[PDB]
C-alpha cells in the first residue's frame, strides 16, 4: 500500500 515491502522474488 505504500511502496517498500515488495520488490518480488
Amino acid at each position: 500500500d505504500p511502496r517498500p515491502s515488495y520488490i518480488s522474488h
Epitope: 500500500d1 505504500p2 517498500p4 515491502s5 515488495y6 522474488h9
Partner: antibody, heavy 120, light 110 residues
C-alpha cells in the same frame, strides 16, 4: 487449519552442515513466501531471509548470505534451509514462518522452530 | 543497523486495554516499514497477529489492532483476555531486511 511442521532438536558438530526442513500443508504451498528467523537467548529474533515457492527467487539478510541457503521442494510442500560451516553462535532455534501478500501485509503461521545445538 | 525497541514488560488486567509500542532508531516508524506484530505463547508457539502496521491476521481475535501512535508503531489490545499473557514481538521492514524488537513481556492478571 494451516500447519508448518519442523523437527524439534538437531545435534551436529562444529564444521559440518545441516539441512533443516519445514513441511507446509493446508493451503496452496506456492501462494505464500517462506521466511526463516533465528532466535538465541539474549538478542531476540533475527531475520535470515526468504524464498518464493513459485519463482524460487530469494532475498537474504546481508549477514546470512554466505551462511544459509533456502530452497523448496514443491511436490512434498516443504521448505529447507542448509547452514554452512557451523559454529557455536549458530546454536539456537530456527523457525520457518509463512508470509502473506497484498499491500505488503503479514506473517500469519509459524513452525514450532527447530533447536539446533552445535557442539563437540 | 536499525535497532528496534519495545517495552521490557507491561502489566494489565482482564477487560482493560493495553498498548504496546515499537521504536525505530533510524527515526520514525512509517507506513513504509510495514510494522508486523507476532505473539509468542510458551514453548515456542508463534502466531502473527498484525502485519503492515494494521492488517489483522485471518483467524485473529477482533480485539487485536495495529496502528501508528506518533513516530512509533503500536499494538492495541482492547479487552485483554487471560490467554493474552505472552510475549509480543515487533517487526520492522527496512528496504530489504526484517528487524525485530526485543519483544514485550505482557501480563494479563487472570
Amino acid at each position: 487449519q494451516v500447519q508448518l511442521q519442523q523437527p524439534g532438536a538437531e545435534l551436529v558438530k562444529p564444521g559440518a552442515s545441516v539441512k533443516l526442513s519445514c513441511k507446509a500443508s493446508g493451503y496452496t504451498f506456492t501462494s505464500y513466501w517462506m521466511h526463516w528467523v533465528k532466535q538465541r537467548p539474549g538478542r531476540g529474533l533475527e531475520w535470515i531471509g526468504r524464498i518464493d515457492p513459485n519463482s524460487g527467487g530469494t532475498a537474504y539478510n546481508e549477514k546470512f548470505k554466505s551462511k544459509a541457503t533456502l530452497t523448496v521442494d514443491k511436490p512434498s510442500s516443504t521448505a529447507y534451509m542448509a547452514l554452512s560451516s557451523l559454529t557455536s553462535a549458530d546454536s539456537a532455534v530456527y523457525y520457518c514462518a509463512r508470509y502473506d501478500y497484498y499491500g505488503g501485509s503479514y506473517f500469519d503461521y509459524w513452525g514450532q522452530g527447530t533447536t539446533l545445538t552445535v557442539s563437540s | 543497523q536499525a535497532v528496534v525497541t519495545q517495552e521490557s514488560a507491561l502489566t494489565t488486567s482482564p477487560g482493560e486495554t493495553v498498548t504496546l509500542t515499537c521504536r525505530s532508531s533510524t527515526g520514525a516508524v512509517t507506513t513504509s516499514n510495514y510494522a508486523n506484530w507476532v505473539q509468542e505463547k510458551p514453548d515456542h508457539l508463534f502466531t502473527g497477529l498484525i502485519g503492515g502496521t494494521n492488517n489483522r491476521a485471518p483467524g485473529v481475535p477482533a480485539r487485536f489492532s495495529g496502528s501508528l501512535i506518533g513516530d512509533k508503531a503500536a499494538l492495541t489490545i482492547t479487552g485483554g483476555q487471560t490467554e493474552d499473557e505472552a510475549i509480543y514481538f515487533c517487526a520492522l521492514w527496512y528496504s530489504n531486511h526484517w528487524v525485530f524488537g526485543g519483544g514485550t513481556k505482557l501480563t494479563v492478571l487472570g
